[PDB]
């Protein structure tokens, strides 16, 4: 059961963490906690198709039921689009709680922390759940907190390259997306579930209900509602359309060759500024003890394969091998996050702990001390990815 839960890919609910030197300053991004789904597209396509064929009684008995589910969870989907959840609220606190118990020494007496989030409501009410927490965890913390439009350019990048936008809406990933599709997804074992004569419908409007399907059951585990739709498809099904929700990811907004890294160079503002933060506070030209951001998979995604973390920037030339190096659900769950932690020695050099999701991560750089890192070092990796980015964005007007 925890790989049907990994099957969920970026829908996948935040991963069970546990409790357990002091650092001086954390510097941080969190994609929006667990979240109703964003469009009723999916629903409604499958409720079309449930509906019609009870015209004509082309239903099963349980397509009957699953009509009947259908139609209950678009009532309770109703005027909650996009929502955070009360999931995706409890992850919140417990990424901040984890964090103040760990660290309760930069946490204390007046220590002052900055948050900046997306225009997007699930991002702010995520970075107001975690915010609470905190304050609840030190009323003496100085709190600056902010959002909006003017964060765009280092939190919502993805919007704002031409390029990358129409490389993501027409791009040459979408074809190589449908055919591993129509590979990989059998929708006539799945419809005879549900539906009379499966086999009268068209390989596309079955693919395309199938794949609405999936969506609907992969997304209930994030809205908190005591309903799950796991058991409509069998593991290996599970499997296979992780898998197609993986490569469309990996090749629509990370380091596939045939996105030619032009999904990952557009993060390089957000690398800057994460680098800029650190700059000034180590400098006492500011004297924020943590600077968080609160946004999205899309920013969470490029950003980790730009500062290279191994493996989420690999460049794999054959679509079916992605899967097998490159997991969506391992970099951006709900409420994916990254921390980096700043520590000083005894003799004032300055070392940074990079945490995916909590968890110690690799750089190709060398160190004496993993998991801690030469923050010079890593300064300078950082600062070459930066420029290799600007590079790569030189081609694309």
Same mark, same amino acid.
């Given at each position: ?199 009268? +419908?068209? /390989? ?5 209900? =199938?794949?609405? @399907?999936?969506?609907?059951? !992969?997304?209930?585990?994030?809205? #908190? ?117 700043? +520590?000083? /020695? ?5 070392? =940074?702990?990079? @945490?995916?999701?909590?968890? !110690?991560?690799?750089?190709?750089? #060398? ?31």
């Amino acid at each position: 059961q925890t790989k049907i839960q990994k099957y969920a890919g970026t829908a996948m609910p935040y991963p069970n963490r546990t409790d357990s030197m002091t650092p001086f300053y954390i510097n941080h991004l969190g994609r929006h906690g667990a979240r109703f789904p964003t469009s009723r597209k999916a629903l409604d396509k499958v409720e079309k198709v449930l509906v019609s064929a009870q015209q004509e009684n082309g239903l099963t008995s349980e397509g009957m039921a699953l009509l009947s589910m259908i139609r209950r969870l678009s009532r309770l989907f109703d005027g909650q689009w996009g929502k955070l959840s009360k999931l995706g609220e409890t992850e919140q606190e417990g990424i901040a709680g984890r964090m103040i118990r760990n660290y309760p020494q930069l946490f204390s007496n007046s220590a002052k922390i900055e948050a900046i989030a997306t225009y997007v409501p699930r991002s702010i009410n995520s970075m107001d759940a975690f915010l609470s927490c905190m304050i609840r965890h030190n009323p003496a913390l100085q709190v600056q907190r902010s959002e909006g439009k003017q964060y765009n350019h280092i939190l919502r990048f993805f919007d704002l390259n031409k390029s990358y936008v129409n490389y993501k809406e027409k791009g040459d990933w979408l074809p190589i997306y449908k055919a591993f599709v129509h590979k990989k997804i059998s929708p006539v074992p799945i419809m005879k579930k549900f539906l009379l004569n499966p086999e009268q +419908y068209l /390989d596309k409007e079955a693919e395309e209900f =199938v794949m609405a @399907l999936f969506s609907v059951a !992969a997304i209930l585990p994030d809205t #908190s509602i005591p309903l799950n739709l796991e058991d409509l498809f069998t593991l290996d099904e599970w499997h296979r359309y992780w898998q197609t929700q993986n490569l469309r990811w990996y090749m629509s907004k990370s380091s596939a060759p045939v996105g030619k890294m032009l999904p990952v160079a557009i993060a390089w503002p957000l690398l800057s500024e994460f680098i800029r933060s650190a700059q000034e506070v180590i400098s006492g030209k500011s004297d924020y003890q943590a600077n968080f951001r609160f946004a999205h998979a899309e920013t969470v995604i490029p950003f980790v394969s730009l500062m290279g973390i191994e493996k989420t920037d690999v460049q794999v030339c054959r679509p079916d091998s992605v899967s097998v190096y490159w997991k969506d659900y391992e970099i951006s769950p709900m409420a994916a996050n990254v921390q980096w932690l700043f +520590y000083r /020695d005894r003799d004032q050099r300055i070392w =940074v702990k990079i @945490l995916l999701n909590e968890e !110690a991560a690799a750089l190709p750089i #060398s160190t004496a001390c993993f998991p801690y890192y030469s923050w010079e070092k890593t300064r300078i990796f950082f600062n070459q990815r930066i420029e290799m980015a600007k590079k790569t964005l030189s081609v694309f007007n």
